[PDB]
């Protein structure tokens, strides 16, 4: 039993033609791609793997000229109809045929697989089971998102997308993979994986666990009539003189700092101790409000770690306190 | 060449260097005393030259002195979360030394990419400018208030230890039961069969009786395994 | 547009005095002044940014403070080389603008 | 870090001129660039700003339509294309760089200046 | 069993003993617990 | 089971994995050991 | 603290970093062992 | 024996000039040079060690670079007290040898 | 650190002379020692080296056979026994110790010098 990006069994695979005037359109890439092509005249000649396919960014190329295999990863300038008529980096060189290929890109590596089963059914994909050996591996590592094929122009091909399923592979004696079961294909197959045997005899078998997913979410907190009196402090008709700074104690109420924050009539909403956004979130036991009147220069003067007339003579602010000075 | 390369890129865009298919000796790296920090997590440093690795990645970048501690498994910091993140489990070594010699001329070439990346997956390089993102209501201009453009610049001056530039290179090893592209400088002995011998093939290790096998591997395969997934058959590296 | 008005437009003082220059914005920009010192015939030099942070290489006597709309540039004790024209400048939004300038001369 | 300005001289009213500011000593392509002008004996007046990539360009009130700012990140050079010049445009023009001194990066600030170049719009010979 | 590698020798390699002891100790408790279950199953099954 | 708190969701929510994994491991061993005892009791009681 | 008695530059103390490659616990290496760090020559300090 | 060739052997410069004192190594020593300043009748003083690392107390206007066989000593702004003879010195192998000396003169 | 030299003066050609160099302020018996000489009006010339323990000694080519460097780790003093003196041996002779700072300590450099002593090989009275 192994878990890997496999083609789900009995899946839908797009079937593009090389007939009547036809084309080879660009298809999205994915965690992996299944490419199976049926041939009588060996028409299919290529692949492309690029993010852009327009020479802006690196684009891997695979092309088979008559007896040579070519791999390049430059920023090629591809034609809008890239077809083969009848900052550069690494390079490599070397229907009766069904040349299946699995092109997967993982962990910065680009892996290719292959098989060449001969077929007599020209209509569609043959029922059967051929495993795919790893043809070549090469460490390209590109943020590949797209995919296009190159056809020899004077042979339909299929495209399927791999998924992260779990499969049970039945290795034979000499090592060929002869059968496999897709553990999530159908409830019968879930049993075969759990039993770890291909034949499942009469009886009832426990396989998996049902679950009900939590649908919504709730966060709660009790409403309270203990609203902060900050508005009363700011809107008091008369404040006392600066020398007699009235100290008002605040407790046992919920404080809407945000409403203060959103209100903009206050000319200066200076804060040192705590960022005003966190004020609503963060909660303390003791809140003290001081009220008094001064000139504009003194509004500057009333700040922590500062020496001045109002700053020192009548109302002093320690460097350390967590608080905000609001003047309008 | 990488360790004593003349220039390394800034941290926000760290170059990734792939090492494979070469014999690598780490005694040379170990022996030099210029290296301020040689901290290794997955593997003890002395044993590096002995072992075989499936893959080696070399990452190079320049950071201030205070940030070197942040380049660690499961470490949280300004540069760690935003710029270069190590998986908690990664098997590798961290190599750091001062850059006041080669840099710190004010030096503004080096950029370290602030708020614009808030949480970052391990081992990706993020170079996107993202003009002014971090947090704001207006967007997509040279705009001011509370946008505060991400790629802020290190200023390196000889005045700047904690603020001195430190070149750091991080080696990540990939370890697996596969053909190890890179191995240490160990000679090969002759093969002995039908006898109880302690053996390591391609750095595989183990003790057993080496016998010729009638079983026929497929060309790509290298290691066989048993029902219990216990290594029973191997393909000799030198002679197939 | 955000308008920044400096007051006084000019003032005379002697070395060692404590000076105060105020810049008031038409709207709250809440931390985004920048204070520069300009001498005649040469480009300005930045002094205080975010209205309260001292820029490297500028003497510690220079100080700025305030947020919102009321801001102050202060030099604790004047020296002969500090007699100059000082501009406030907002960065809250575009277009960026300057104050009209405050000239400090010798008394 | 150096900003070399050029392109000044005498221009008749109504003609055009291109100002240049060559950047060195820092990574130019990542910073906004500003033009600031100073009329003779007058105060500073912000002129134009361009984003790092040149996609965003804003101009002051007095120069909308006439002034065009441009950028060459390959040569690390800043340009200011001034058109339909008039008597009031006479000023010593500075190129300037965004900059931010420490970690209060939410300040986005103003910094090092070029030496400034004089532009005289006049029909005099 | 919550250790860096299941193969005991790979723990003997790949790091020196003073730290490797911690990784091995995690392996032992897991393996030892497996026998406790397996033996206890036999006794009960042997009684049957 | 000699951990910070009995509720699994607490240790997950307040602390991120690098530290919590040690605590979660402790709850696993305690709970898993508790499950062993109940099953072994059932097997013995089932035989009776 | 030892500033009051020591640190007068006081070069009296020795710490032997370069070629002391490893020591076993509770072991003193009092052999001067002129120099090794890595190369074949000797009899000079060299580079 | 490693041979060190300085170029030029003598030079005339003015106060404030940027002057470069060059040393060539016969074979690669790659980071090992030590630069010294010697004035007539006085013992030499170390200025640059490891061919690029500044000696304690040496003012920053002295700067060094190079690796292999290509090395320079550079003075950003010559001072009147900097007029003297300068020697490069190799330490790859024994015996240690010196450059022939570069005399910095007043122009 | 101090290096006080002595033993210099006038000597008849072909005779012998021994210089002394008194070391203090550092661990003498642990640092290698050098003699360096400077002939009147000429450049610097390396003379000899002795190891910390005195087992290792090298000499310059022009003094091979005649000059012997020695060491007294008890008295913390360096010597230079000059034999078969000749006119070209007239020079101002300095003693110095190896020294390395703290960080790049792997690279061996040079440092603090003795004040120098004058030896003149001439037959004049
Ligand atoms: C590979 O490139 C694609 C773009 O083609 C990246 O996808 C974008 O990811 C960002 C996340 O920061 C999204 O906001 C964008 O919407 C995505 N693009 C599209 C078109 O949806 C992708 O992130 C890149 N790969 C990696 C690993 O970063
Ligand atoms: C905890 C807190 O409120 N800290 C604030 C910080 O948010 C703000 O940026 C700074 C202004 O320079 O003043 C302080
Ligand atoms: C890791 C590495 O190769 N470090 C080398 C060091 O071994 C060598 O002695 C030195 C000489 O310049 O250069 C560096
Ligand atoms: C396959 O495609 C057919 C339509 O052609 C659709 O009805 C069916 O649901 C698809 N099956 C899957 C598994 O996607
Ligand atoms: C096939 O394509 C490669 C790609 O560059 C080209 O170089 C080569 O000449 C072509 N033909 C052959 C026969 O390889
Ligand atoms: C090649 O890569 C470099 C890497 O930064 C890039 O600057 C350059 O623009 C690339 N070449 C082209 C033609 O874009
Ligand atoms: C064993 O190998 C032979 C080829 O020598 C082949 O005929 C036979 O099918 C193989 N067995 C299996 C299960 O593949």
Short mmCIF file of N, CA, C and O in Angstrom, two decimals, chain A residues 27-100:
data_model
loop_
_atom_site.label_atom_id
_atom_site.label_comp_id
_atom_site.label_asym_id
_atom_site.label_seq_id
_atom_site.Cartn_x
_atom_site.Cartn_y
_atom_site.Cartn_z
N UNK A 27 -3.41 23.41 -22.34
CA UNK A 27 -4.18 22.84 -21.25
C UNK A 27 -3.52 23.21 -19.93
O UNK A 27 -2.29 23.32 -19.86
N UNK A 28 -4.30 23.42 -18.88
CA UNK A 28 -3.69 23.67 -17.57
C UNK A 28 -2.89 22.47 -17.11
O UNK A 28 -3.28 21.32 -17.33
N UNK A 29 -1.73 22.74 -16.52
CA UNK A 29 -1.04 21.74 -15.72
C UNK A 29 -1.64 21.69 -14.32
O UNK A 29 -2.51 22.50 -14.00
N UNK A 30 -1.08 20.87 -13.45
CA UNK A 30 -1.63 20.46 -12.15
C UNK A 30 -0.51 19.74 -11.40
O UNK A 30 0.58 19.56 -11.94
N UNK A 31 -0.78 19.33 -10.16
CA UNK A 31 0.15 18.48 -9.42
C UNK A 31 0.72 17.37 -10.29
O UNK A 31 1.85 16.92 -10.07
N UNK A 32 -0.04 16.90 -11.28
CA UNK A 32 0.48 15.96 -12.25
C UNK A 32 -0.43 15.89 -13.45
O UNK A 32 -1.54 16.42 -13.43
N UNK A 33 0.06 15.25 -14.51
CA UNK A 33 -0.70 15.13 -15.74
C UNK A 33 -0.48 13.75 -16.34
O UNK A 33 0.64 13.23 -16.33
N UNK A 34 -1.55 13.15 -16.84
CA UNK A 34 -1.50 11.89 -17.56
C UNK A 34 -1.64 12.16 -19.04
O UNK A 34 -2.61 12.79 -19.47
N UNK A 35 -0.68 11.70 -19.83
CA UNK A 35 -0.68 11.95 -21.26
C UNK A 35 -0.53 10.61 -21.97
O UNK A 35 0.54 10.01 -21.95
N UNK A 36 -1.61 10.15 -22.60
CA UNK A 36 -1.58 8.92 -23.37
C UNK A 36 -1.93 9.23 -24.81
O UNK A 36 -2.98 9.81 -25.08
N UNK A 37 -1.07 8.83 -25.73
CA UNK A 37 -1.24 9.14 -27.13
C UNK A 37 -1.22 7.86 -27.95
O UNK A 37 -0.31 7.03 -27.79
N UNK A 38 -2.20 7.70 -28.83
CA UNK A 38 -2.30 6.53 -29.70
C UNK A 38 -1.79 6.91 -31.08
O UNK A 38 -2.08 8.02 -31.55
N UNK A 39 -1.05 6.01 -31.74
CA UNK A 39 -0.31 6.34 -32.96
C UNK A 39 -0.46 5.26 -34.03
O UNK A 39 -0.57 4.07 -33.72
N UNK A 40 -0.47 5.69 -35.30
CA UNK A 40 -0.06 4.86 -36.43
C UNK A 40 1.12 5.45 -37.20
O UNK A 40 1.89 4.69 -37.79
N UNK A 41 1.33 6.77 -37.14
CA UNK A 41 2.40 7.43 -37.88
C UNK A 41 3.25 8.33 -37.00
O UNK A 41 3.98 9.20 -37.51
N UNK A 42 3.21 8.11 -35.70
CA UNK A 42 4.22 8.63 -34.83
C UNK A 42 4.25 10.15 -34.93
O UNK A 42 5.32 10.79 -34.91
N UNK A 43 3.05 10.74 -35.01
CA UNK A 43 2.88 12.16 -35.30
C UNK A 43 3.31 13.02 -34.13
O UNK A 43 4.00 14.03 -34.31
N UNK A 44 2.91 12.64 -32.93
CA UNK A 44 3.17 13.44 -31.74
C UNK A 44 4.66 13.51 -31.46
O UNK A 44 5.37 12.50 -31.46
N UNK A 45 5.14 14.72 -31.23
CA UNK A 45 6.57 14.95 -31.17
C UNK A 45 7.00 15.78 -29.98
O UNK A 45 8.20 16.07 -29.88
N UNK A 46 6.10 16.16 -29.09
CA UNK A 46 6.58 17.16 -28.17
C UNK A 46 5.73 17.43 -26.96
O UNK A 46 4.62 16.93 -26.80
N UNK A 47 6.31 18.27 -26.10
CA UNK A 47 5.63 18.77 -24.92
C UNK A 47 6.23 20.12 -24.57
O UNK A 47 7.31 20.49 -25.03
N UNK A 48 5.51 20.87 -23.76
CA UNK A 48 6.01 22.14 -23.24
C UNK A 48 5.60 22.23 -21.78
O UNK A 48 4.56 21.69 -21.40
N UNK A 49 6.45 22.84 -20.95
CA UNK A 49 6.17 23.05 -19.52
C UNK A 49 6.71 24.42 -19.14
O UNK A 49 7.90 24.59 -18.85
N UNK A 50 5.85 25.42 -19.19
CA UNK A 50 6.23 26.77 -18.84
C UNK A 50 5.16 27.44 -18.03
O UNK A 50 3.99 27.07 -18.07
N UNK A 51 5.58 28.44 -17.26
CA UNK A 51 4.60 29.27 -16.57
C UNK A 51 3.91 30.21 -17.55
O UNK A 51 2.69 30.40 -17.48
N UNK A 52 4.67 30.81 -18.46
CA UNK A 52 4.15 31.81 -19.38
C UNK A 52 4.16 31.36 -20.83
O UNK A 52 3.25 31.71 -21.59
N UNK A 53 5.19 30.62 -21.25
CA UNK A 53 5.35 30.16 -22.63
C UNK A 53 5.56 31.32 -23.60
O UNK A 53 5.21 31.22 -24.78
N UNK A 54 6.13 32.42 -23.12
CA UNK A 54 6.31 33.57 -24.00
C UNK A 54 7.68 34.24 -23.84
O UNK A 54 7.80 35.43 -24.14
N UNK A 55 8.69 33.52 -23.36
CA UNK A 55 10.07 33.95 -23.18
C UNK A 55 10.24 34.89 -21.99
O UNK A 55 11.35 35.35 -21.74
N UNK A 56 9.17 35.21 -21.26
CA UNK A 56 9.34 35.98 -20.04
C UNK A 56 10.01 35.15 -18.96
O UNK A 56 10.92 35.63 -18.27
N UNK A 57 9.59 33.90 -18.80
CA UNK A 57 10.08 33.03 -17.75
C UNK A 57 10.48 31.69 -18.35
O UNK A 57 10.13 31.37 -19.48
N UNK A 58 11.21 30.91 -17.56
CA UNK A 58 11.75 29.65 -18.03
C UNK A 58 10.62 28.70 -18.43
O UNK A 58 9.59 28.63 -17.76
N UNK A 59 10.83 27.98 -19.52
CA UNK A 59 9.83 27.05 -20.04
C UNK A 59 10.53 25.80 -20.53
O UNK A 59 11.30 25.85 -21.49
N UNK A 60 10.26 24.68 -19.87
CA UNK A 60 10.89 23.42 -20.26
C UNK A 60 10.33 22.93 -21.58
O UNK A 60 9.14 23.10 -21.88
N UNK A 61 11.18 22.31 -22.38
CA UNK A 61 10.81 21.79 -23.69
C UNK A 61 11.26 20.35 -23.83
O UNK A 61 12.36 19.99 -23.41
N UNK A 62 10.40 19.52 -24.42
CA UNK A 62 10.76 18.16 -24.80
C UNK A 62 10.33 17.97 -26.25
O UNK A 62 9.14 18.11 -26.56
N UNK A 63 11.28 17.67 -27.12
CA UNK A 63 11.00 17.45 -28.53
C UNK A 63 11.86 16.31 -29.04
O UNK A 63 13.05 16.22 -28.73
N UNK A 64 11.25 15.45 -29.84
CA UNK A 64 11.94 14.30 -30.44
C UNK A 64 12.11 14.63 -31.92
O UNK A 64 11.17 14.48 -32.70
N UNK A 65 13.29 15.13 -32.31
CA UNK A 65 13.71 15.16 -33.71
C UNK A 65 14.36 13.82 -34.03
O UNK A 65 14.91 13.16 -33.13
N UNK A 66 14.36 13.46 -35.32
CA UNK A 66 14.12 12.10 -35.83
C UNK A 66 14.70 11.06 -34.88
O UNK A 66 13.93 10.20 -34.41
N UNK A 67 15.98 11.11 -34.52
CA UNK A 67 16.54 10.14 -33.59
C UNK A 67 17.09 10.79 -32.33
O UNK A 67 17.85 10.14 -31.61
N UNK A 68 16.75 12.04 -32.06
CA UNK A 68 17.31 12.76 -30.92
C UNK A 68 16.19 13.23 -29.99
O UNK A 68 15.13 13.66 -30.45
N UNK A 69 16.44 13.12 -28.69
CA UNK A 69 15.56 13.65 -27.66
C UNK A 69 16.18 14.92 -27.13
O UNK A 69 17.36 14.93 -26.74
N UNK A 70 15.42 16.00 -27.12
CA UNK A 70 15.95 17.30 -26.75
C UNK A 70 15.18 17.85 -25.56
O UNK A 70 13.95 17.84 -25.53
N UNK A 71 15.92 18.36 -24.58
CA UNK A 71 15.35 18.99 -23.41
C UNK A 71 16.07 20.30 -23.16
O UNK A 71 17.30 20.32 -23.04
N UNK A 72 15.32 21.39 -23.09
CA UNK A 72 15.89 22.70 -22.84
C UNK A 72 14.98 23.47 -21.90
O UNK A 72 13.78 23.22 -21.84
N UNK A 73 15.58 24.40 -21.15
CA UNK A 73 14.84 25.17 -20.16
C UNK A 73 15.08 26.67 -20.29
O UNK A 73 15.03 27.41 -19.30
N UNK A 74 15.34 27.15 -21.51
CA UNK A 74 15.51 28.58 -21.75
C UNK A 74 14.17 29.30 -21.64
O UNK A 74 13.12 28.70 -21.40
N UNK A 75 14.22 30.63 -21.83
CA UNK A 75 13.02 31.44 -22.07
C UNK A 75 12.79 31.55 -23.58
O UNK A 75 13.00 32.59 -24.22
N UNK A 76 12.33 30.44 -24.16
CA UNK A 76 12.03 30.39 -25.58
C UNK A 76 10.90 31.32 -25.98
O UNK A 76 9.99 31.59 -25.19
N UNK A 77 10.96 31.80 -27.21
CA UNK A 77 9.85 32.52 -27.82
C UNK A 77 9.04 31.51 -28.63
O UNK A 77 9.40 31.16 -29.75
N UNK A 78 7.96 31.02 -28.03
CA UNK A 78 7.04 30.10 -28.69
C UNK A 78 6.00 30.83 -29.54
O UNK A 78 5.43 31.84 -29.13
N UNK A 79 5.76 30.28 -30.73
CA UNK A 79 4.71 30.76 -31.60
C UNK A 79 3.34 30.49 -30.98
O UNK A 79 3.17 29.56 -30.18
N UNK A 80 2.37 31.31 -31.36
CA UNK A 80 1.01 31.12 -30.87
C UNK A 80 0.48 29.75 -31.25
O UNK A 80 -0.25 29.11 -30.48
N UNK A 81 0.82 29.29 -32.46
CA UNK A 81 0.57 27.93 -32.90
C UNK A 81 1.90 27.19 -32.98
O UNK A 81 2.47 27.08 -34.08
N UNK A 82 2.43 26.68 -31.88
CA UNK A 82 3.75 26.04 -31.93
C UNK A 82 3.67 24.63 -32.51
O UNK A 82 3.19 23.71 -31.85
N UNK A 83 4.15 24.47 -33.73
CA UNK A 83 4.03 23.21 -34.46
C UNK A 83 5.33 22.92 -35.19
O UNK A 83 6.06 23.84 -35.57
N UNK A 84 5.61 21.65 -35.38
CA UNK A 84 6.82 21.21 -36.05
C UNK A 84 6.42 20.65 -37.41
O UNK A 84 5.81 19.58 -37.49
N UNK A 85 6.75 21.38 -38.47
CA UNK A 85 6.36 20.97 -39.80
C UNK A 85 7.17 19.79 -40.31
O UNK A 85 8.33 19.58 -39.95
N UNK A 86 6.54 19.03 -41.20
CA UNK A 86 7.18 17.87 -41.82
C UNK A 86 8.15 18.34 -42.89
O UNK A 86 7.79 19.15 -43.75
N UNK A 87 19.33 34.42 -21.09
CA UNK A 87 19.21 33.64 -19.87
C UNK A 87 18.85 32.19 -20.18
O UNK A 87 17.73 31.75 -19.95
N UNK A 88 19.82 31.44 -20.69
CA UNK A 88 19.66 30.02 -20.98
C UNK A 88 20.38 29.13 -19.98
O UNK A 88 21.32 29.55 -19.31
N UNK A 89 19.89 27.90 -19.87
CA UNK A 89 20.32 26.92 -18.88
C UNK A 89 20.35 25.50 -19.45
O UNK A 89 20.45 25.33 -20.67
N UNK A 90 20.28 24.50 -18.57
CA UNK A 90 20.55 23.10 -18.91
C UNK A 90 19.93 22.63 -20.22
O UNK A 90 18.88 23.10 -20.65
N UNK A 91 20.62 21.68 -20.86
CA UNK A 91 20.14 20.98 -22.05
C UNK A 91 20.54 19.52 -21.96
O UNK A 91 21.60 19.18 -21.43
N UNK A 92 19.69 18.65 -22.50
CA UNK A 92 19.97 17.22 -22.58
C UNK A 92 19.69 16.70 -23.98
O UNK A 92 18.76 17.16 -24.65
N UNK A 93 20.49 15.73 -24.42
CA UNK A 93 20.31 15.08 -25.71
C UNK A 93 20.49 13.58 -25.53
O UNK A 93 21.10 13.12 -24.56
N UNK A 94 19.94 12.82 -26.47
CA UNK A 94 20.18 11.38 -26.52
C UNK A 94 20.74 11.01 -27.88
O UNK A 94 20.48 11.70 -28.87
N UNK A 95 -4.84 2.59 -34.28
CA UNK A 95 -3.54 3.03 -33.79
C UNK A 95 -2.82 1.89 -33.08
O UNK A 95 -3.37 1.26 -32.19
N UNK A 96 -1.57 1.65 -33.48
CA UNK A 96 -0.85 0.45 -33.08
C UNK A 96 0.14 0.68 -31.95
O UNK A 96 0.66 -0.29 -31.40
N UNK A 97 0.42 1.93 -31.61
CA UNK A 97 1.32 2.25 -30.50
C UNK A 97 0.61 3.22 -29.58
O UNK A 97 0.08 4.24 -30.03
N UNK A 98 0.61 2.91 -28.29
CA UNK A 98 0.01 3.75 -27.28
C UNK A 98 1.13 4.16 -26.34
O UNK A 98 1.53 3.39 -25.46
N UNK A 99 1.67 5.36 -26.54
CA UNK A 99 2.86 5.80 -25.82
C UNK A 99 2.46 6.63 -24.60
O UNK A 99 2.58 7.85 -24.57
N UNK A 100 1.98 5.93 -23.57
CA UNK A 100 1.53 6.62 -22.37
C UNK A 100 2.69 7.27 -21.64
O UNK A 100 3.80 6.73 -21.60
#
